Amino acid sequence: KALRPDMGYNTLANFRIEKKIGRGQFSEVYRAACLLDGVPVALKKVQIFDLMDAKARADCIKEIDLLKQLNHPNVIKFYASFIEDNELNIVLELADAGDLSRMIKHFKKQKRLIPERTVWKYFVQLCSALEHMHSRRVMHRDIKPANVFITATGVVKLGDLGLVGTPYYMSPERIHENGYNFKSDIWSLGCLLYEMAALQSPFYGDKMNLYSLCKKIEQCDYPPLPSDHYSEELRQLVNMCINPDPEKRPDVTYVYDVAKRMHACTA
Template sequence: MSSSSTSSPNTSVVPTSSSFGSNNGLNLLYNNNNNSTTIDINGQQQQQLLLLSSLDPNCYNNLDYFELSGKLGKGQFSEVLKAKNRITGKMVAIKKIELDLMKNKKAREDCRKEIDLLKQLQHENIIRYYCSFIAKEYLMIVLELAEAGDLSRLLRSPERMNENGYSFKSDIWSLGCVLYEMAALQSPFFGEKQNLLALVRKISKCEYPPIPSNIYSQQLRLTVSNCICANPARRFDARDVLTVSG
């Protein structure tokens, strides 16, 4: 049984000449109570469905093949579920995105870019993309499960911790935390037997040990300190990071 030959009452998969990497955009068709709906990233209503191909022949493009076992996390537009493939027994993570939220052109474009990028990344230290498919009114992205758990608490910026919105500057904060950990071999806000309240306080006040100046370059230390900055307005942007590290 292959992913391309399997369908369900709520999922229709029809090959077209389009792909996630093409300039034709993203077309998503789903059936809900026998009513066909098409969402086209270019804003045109077309009766067409993009074939969402699988990179893993053992991962089937149909939600019926997965046994859901709980929620791993939730984002602004999606939630991530833990699931087991009923055929292979493999544990996976499924990112569940509401198609209604993709009526915004930018949201659809961001989603298309995310999947396109995931399909290109092949490395043992990067979460692997398996497949994507439509189930009812949701886009489902099946990914490798990170068994060790969630690092988001240690990478979350002060504004995200306080639920004050999200921007690209929040990602710059996370980048700073990753760079710090690559150098120091531990999170900047790590603490033995540390409770959540103590972690939140450390992040809010940017309390972390400095990177040793006798070991690491000024460029690295400057980049980290300006990425891990409590005020998003004063935080580096991507161009600043490239300029300093240049």
């Protein structure tokens, strides 16, 4: 298939699928090169006709329609979304420079704790990205370190390429099968903040299993962070986020105002 500069980013013909980078239940993400300018992009192909029914497909296109409208320097940008070759193809901003999962495992391998100054520098950006999504009535639905990308310049980019077989951060609303809400993203955010400081999930176990996990979540049983290295503000914020009741969790604006204030004084 031949190139068409008239169409721009809104046709598959103008892209070269370099490699696969993610695989979901309904989609597959690729690294591709925009043939028009040579700039590399992420290309997501969602199988809305073959893997989905009418309802799921309607909901999916509605979700993408709102997501393509998001514009924040800390949120992976959507360039295009079009139906071609019986799929919904999304042209996304590429962030190959690394992530927070990679950063955590690096400090873990080097047997070092991430300094609180550093924790807030990345965390404030993650809150900024999420404040924007929530303000435009959009849930992330999977906040985990692997989805918090870091560009070479140190800029955070919140994306999505994601006996257990459950989400990364199990929540009370998942155990009760109650459904995901904006306050579900707050639980994840509180867990992620803890993981930055502890170098492990709050409900991680050397020999972790479903029974033990549910017991720990019911009781909100996580080892407290060293007060010698991490401030009472950092520990209080984790504590008010990791709360069983979604309605008692703070909204993102509140988390974001705390991180802005904390970043400002720790730096």
